[PDB]
Design an enzyme around this catalytic site. Structure first.
Site, PDB file in Angstrom:
ATOM      1  N   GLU A 171      -9.408  -4.267  -3.148  1.00  0.00           N
ATOM      2  CA  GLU A 171      -8.652  -3.218  -2.500  1.00  0.00           C
ATOM      3  C   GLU A 171      -9.562  -2.175  -1.885  1.00  0.00           C
ATOM      4  OE1 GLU A 171      -5.528  -3.505  -1.986  1.00  0.00           O
ATOM      5  OE2 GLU A 171      -4.586  -4.649  -3.575  1.00  0.00           O
ATOM      6  N   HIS A 190      -7.802  -5.284   1.431  1.00  0.00           N
ATOM      7  CA  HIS A 190      -6.617  -4.473   1.689  1.00  0.00           C
ATOM      8  C   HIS A 190      -5.710  -5.073   2.794  1.00  0.00           C
ATOM      9  CE1 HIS A 190      -4.359  -0.847   2.554  1.00  0.00           C
ATOM     10  NE2 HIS A 190      -4.701  -0.950   3.826  1.00  0.00           N
ATOM     11  N   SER A 246       0.830  -1.157   0.000  1.00  0.00           N
ATOM     12  CA  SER A 246       0.000   0.000   0.000  1.00  0.00           C
ATOM     13  C   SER A 246       0.904   1.260   0.000  1.00  0.00           C
ATOM     14  CB  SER A 246      -0.999  -0.074   1.168  1.00  0.00           C
ATOM     15  OG  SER A 246      -1.961   0.963   1.019  1.00  0.00           O
TER      16      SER A 246
END
Ligand SMILES: COc1cc2c(c3oc(=O)c4c(c13)CCC4=O)[C@@H]1C=CO[C@@H]1O2
Ligand SMILES: COc1cc2c(c3oc(=O)c4c(c13)CCC4=O)[C@@H]1C=CO[C@@H]1O2
Ligand SMILES: *[C@@H]1O[C@H](CO)[C@@H](O)[C@H](O)[C@H]1NC(C)=O
Ligand SMILES: *[C@@H]1O[C@H](CO)[C@@H](O)[C@H](O)[C@H]1NC(C)=O
Ligand SMILES: *[C@@H]1O[C@H](CO)[C@@H](O)[C@H](O)[C@H]1NC(C)=O
Ligand SMILES: *[C@@H]1O[C@H](CO)[C@@H](O)[C@H](O)[C@H]1NC(C)=O
Ligand SMILES: *[C@@H]1O[C@H](CO)[C@@H](O)[C@H](O)[C@H]1NC(C)=O
Ligand SMILES: [Cl-]
Ligand SMILES: [Cl-]
Ligand SMILES: [Cl-]
Ligand SMILES: [Cl-]
Ligand SMILES: [K+]
EC number: 3.1.1.7
Lengths: 530, 532
Positions: free
Chosen positions: A324, A437, A197
């Site tokens: 995501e 995520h 990320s």
């Protein structure tokens, strides 16, 4: 002995740690910089001055000052990401796991945590390096870096709050690895940086930045690339946000210097309490203090760098998760809930695309809406929920990564692309959220190997496959071990990637090509035009 | 005497014609206007002056002056649409088929041919009225109207070439039916107007136009509606085109009067020869002389009339064919051929898109391209060919019709919507072209009832139910015979938006005809082109 290592800035005493019915060496909380405290808040890191006597490196360090998520108190799925140590501005430390007995000169992997440039810690349970270090016989470092205002307050022109200092913290930890990892049996010429990320955005920033290029060999980017829309701001936008930060805190604004000195007197939590206020819009997946395109760390725009091939030419391995976007909808979009299936009305879908693409005019919102709405069935709350999840994920992670992978491949020396889509066995979050995520991280760090953690056998096996792909890539520039089913090179022409899940490896082409042409070619041109 | 009719402008003598081993009466080539010739070229039509004696109405009249297609010489697929009579400016005539024996006061249907407002004839084989009139016991009329410059030259402000005179030709034939059809045992209170493509757009224009409304009871529109992008132009654009026509013929352009005088002295063929030169762009599915939004025949914009419900409130039946665009690609887009499967390259797809949406800016072209390209497979020749076909059909016919039907249904008294998707077994066009523009006509007019034309028994059955739907709708405002056990064609409603397939299979009801693509064409694209 094995645990007593003389480094260039002084001696460190590590600790023998248990790992899967065996042991290895851990050196925790090793200082790589002077504490960036007092008049040093907002400034470039200075190298750590030498100490005498032996540094006790048996214990995790403090985490950096950051916003702490309290939306679901007690809930492991949000809480696993929050600091597990005292927070302090004195937080620039790294951790090392060394195989035992000490290897001669082995592949080094340096983990860079995510958390949106506003949070993160090297000390999280999910980043425990001992599993990957033992299993793959690598030397694993986790660095830290300042986040939020402390790391990214940007007043370009000022030497006092220049911006990007969190990125320089990472680079200083890299320099330290280059200077010292040979003392821990590491090969400083075979360093892989990896992160997820914002940590993946960070990895790609060091690929782009000429001052970072010679401090690593190869790179892995997980669910993040440098060009993500949330990952940088212009110097003018960073400036506006910094003045707005001071405005919020009743600071003198007549000069950069006055603003900066007012903000340095403030207690850390005073900065954090008002951090989210400086954002220019109601939004999701937008963070306040992030890297700035300053002309120094980044000589020119990220796009022009990518097109001219002004970046490190090496091997990269990168990829994305199926869903995501879902974590971010849950936090900021209307109609979503942890405790329900989160069927989205048409009204809430409209308000969600606006929050998701806060920079779009009305024409661009309609464009997004049309692109993700099924007009044979528009009041279907399930298709509305999944549609929003895809917007957020496609806009913010997947499509920027695909642009980066296509641009990189034209110049680099080998690209490997993955699509991570495994459905959890231990479902912490609800089903609608899908492959969340950060979920691939557990697999990368070998948590499925820990019997007490109650993953399935198929998950242990997938974690082992992933660790071995990662480490083999780190060793050679190729996730495949010569001889046997192969993860093929992503090429400009064929654009092959693999799924990563518990099924036998399947090879596909053109990851989300249809939506990514919308996000990478048509929308920007629409917004440029209207 | 069945064949001798005294109409309001004089006597008419028709002819007994054979039909499917029976007989009926035909009155062919009845004049409904003065010959719009000489100093009357471009002018509004004038009613036909009463004649002495018996008008011989036993043969088809002349066709209006028009461009003649000869891309494929000797080929029946193109040639069936060309004039089969001598062309003349003296062309304002109508044809009537009346059941034998003469009915008392029966349902009337009036056919308005298509042909892009630049061509067409009431006399084509495919418009032969005898099958429908006989089989459905209806009085069937086919009218004519001036096309091309002759029918649509528009110099707003002049009463010499005001524009829309071809539409007024149609109105006048309607007025004639209103005044005279009772003499043929037709009911003038039960007239259905129907037509295809430009004919269908015309029907919709009569629905809208206050001056036409009281001249028919209800309406059928096949593959056309009044709001079609090719079916009208602004006064400004009509003027530009009229002046471009003058310039092509070395006319004096100093005043409308001089331009019009100049154009009235040219031979018809001189106008036709340069007709296509006045179009603003290299294009596909665009025609030079078409209805103008004048503030007279059309009091305000088509869109403002449709929103306010300023239009005839009645029952409508309408629909489209599966592959409306194919005919037009064949004629003007690169990589298409009637003698090959017409697999289209990426480069020719880009070219086709530009030709198809000639008014679009670069961004608009990009949106069209994106909307119709499979980026997993962008070099598929077949997908690129079909994509183009869909674009041409969606933009020019389907989405305009769907916009019309939605707008109409808010105010109207009954809407029935069809999707014709049968490809005829004896088609001379290649397979790639699918269900072509105009090819529902032969079913509507009952040609599959003739054994020598070699349609299937399934095609005969289909034509019989189409004719019975159309006539039953004409008779009652509902294509369904109540109390019958047959599959039911449901009303199209604002909420459910239902339609039927028309093909050789049992009926299937669907909903939201091509909704995805028509939101793009009817909402998103115009918003985008309107942006700067
Ligand atoms: C107080 O507002 C916010 C709180 C917040 C987040 C946020 O993420 C965002 O992307 C965002 C906001 C957030 C406000 C506006 C915005 O874009 C993190 C998500 C999950 O945990 C973090 O907590
Ligand atoms: C001379 O150019 C054209 C000739 C032409 C057509 C055309 O249809 C069109 O839509 C069109 C052109 C045509 C030129 C530009 C255009 O849009 C009919 C098709 C089939 O037969 C008709 O012949
Ligand atoms: C380092 O710290 C731990 C406890 O915090 C302690 O048990 C260990 O012995 C220390 N090492 C020293 C004091 O040398
Ligand atoms: C990487 O560089 C090597 C050595 O020059 C070269 O042979 C090859 O073209 C490159 N490999 C890839 C996958 O581009
Ligand atoms: C995992 O499984 C064990 C053994 O069945 C059980 O006792 C324990 O509750 C589970 N642990 C966690 C942390 O969920
Ligand atoms: C009318 O014209 C037809 C065809 O030319 C001719 O055969 C017929 O005899 C004419 N009828 C009369 C009554 O003159
Ligand atoms: C048509 O009009 C009649 C008379 O008002 C009315 O009863 C009927 O409901 C209308 N039908 C439709 C389908 O609108
Ligand atoms: Cl353990
Ligand atoms: Cl390549
Ligand atoms: Cl016959
Ligand atoms: Cl309704
Ligand atoms: K200062």
């Amino acid at each position: 002995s094995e645990l007593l290592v003389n480094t260039k800035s002084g001696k460190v005493m590590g600790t023998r740690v248990p790992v899967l019915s065996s042991h290895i060496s851990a050196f925790l909380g090793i200082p790589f910089a002077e504490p960036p405290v007092g008049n040093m808040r907002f400034r470039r890191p200075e190298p750590k001055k030498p100490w005498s006597g032996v540094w006790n490196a048996s214990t995790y360090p403090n985490n950096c000052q950051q916003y702490v998520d309290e939306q679901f108190p007690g809930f492991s799925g949000s809480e696993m990401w929050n600091p597990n140590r005292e927070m302090s501005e004195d937080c620039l430390y790294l951790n090392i796991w060394v195989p035992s007995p000490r290897p001669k000169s082995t592949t080094v992997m340096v983990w860079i945590y995510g958390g949106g440039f506003y949070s993160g810690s090297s000390t999280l349970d999910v980043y425990n390096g001992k599993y990957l270090a033992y299993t793959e016989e690598v030397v694993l470092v986790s660095l830290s870096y300042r986040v939020g205002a402390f790391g990214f307050l940007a007043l370009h022109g000022s030497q006092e709050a220049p911006g990007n200092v969190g990125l320089l913290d990472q680079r200083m930890a890299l320099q330290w690895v280059h200077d010292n990892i040979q003392f821990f049996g590491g090969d400083p010429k075979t360093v892989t940086i990896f992160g997820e990320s914002a940590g993946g955005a960070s990895v790609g920033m060091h690929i782009l930045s000429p001052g970072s290029r010679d401090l690593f060999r190869r790179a892995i980017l997980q669910s993040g690339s440098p060009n993500c829309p949330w990952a940088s701001v212009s110097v003018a936008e960073g400036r506006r946000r910094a003045v707005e930060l001071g405005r919020n805190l009743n600071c003198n604004l007549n000069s950069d210097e006055e603003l900066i000195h007012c903000l340095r007197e403030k207690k850390p939590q005073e900065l954090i309490d008002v951090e989210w206020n400086v954002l220019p819009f109601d939004s999701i997946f937008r963070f306040s203090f992030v890297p700035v395109i300053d002309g120094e760390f980044f000589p020119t725009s990220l796009e022009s760098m990518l097109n001219s091939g002004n970046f490190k030419k090496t091997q990269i391995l990168l990829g994305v998760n199926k869903d995501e976007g879902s974590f971010f909808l849950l936090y900021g979009a209307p109609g979503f809930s942890k405790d329900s299936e989160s069927k989205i009305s048409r009204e809430d879908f409209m308000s969600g695309v606006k929050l998701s693409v806060p920079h779009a005019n009305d024409l661009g919102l309609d464009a997004v809406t049309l692109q993700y709405t099924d007009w044979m069935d528009d009041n279907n709350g399930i298709k509305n929920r999944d549609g929003l999840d895809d917007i957020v994920g496609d806009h913010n992670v997947i499509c920027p990564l695909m642009h980066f992978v296509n641009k990189y491949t034209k110049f680099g020396n080998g690209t490997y692309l993955y699509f991570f889509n495994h459905r959890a066995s231990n479902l912490v979050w609800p089903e609608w959220m899908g492959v969340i995520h950060g979920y691939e991280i557990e697999f990368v760090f070998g948590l499925p190997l820990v019997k007490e953690l109650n993953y399935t056998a198929e998950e242990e096996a997938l974690s082992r496959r992933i660790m071995h792909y990662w480490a083999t890539f780190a060793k050679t520039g190729n996730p495949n071990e010569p001889h046997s089913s192969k993860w093929p090179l992503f090429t400009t022409k064929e654009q092959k990637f693999i799924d990563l899940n518990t099924e036998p490896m399947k090879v596909h082409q053109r990851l989300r090509v249809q939506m990514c042409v919308f996000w990478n070619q048509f929308l920007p041109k629409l917004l440029n035009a209207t």
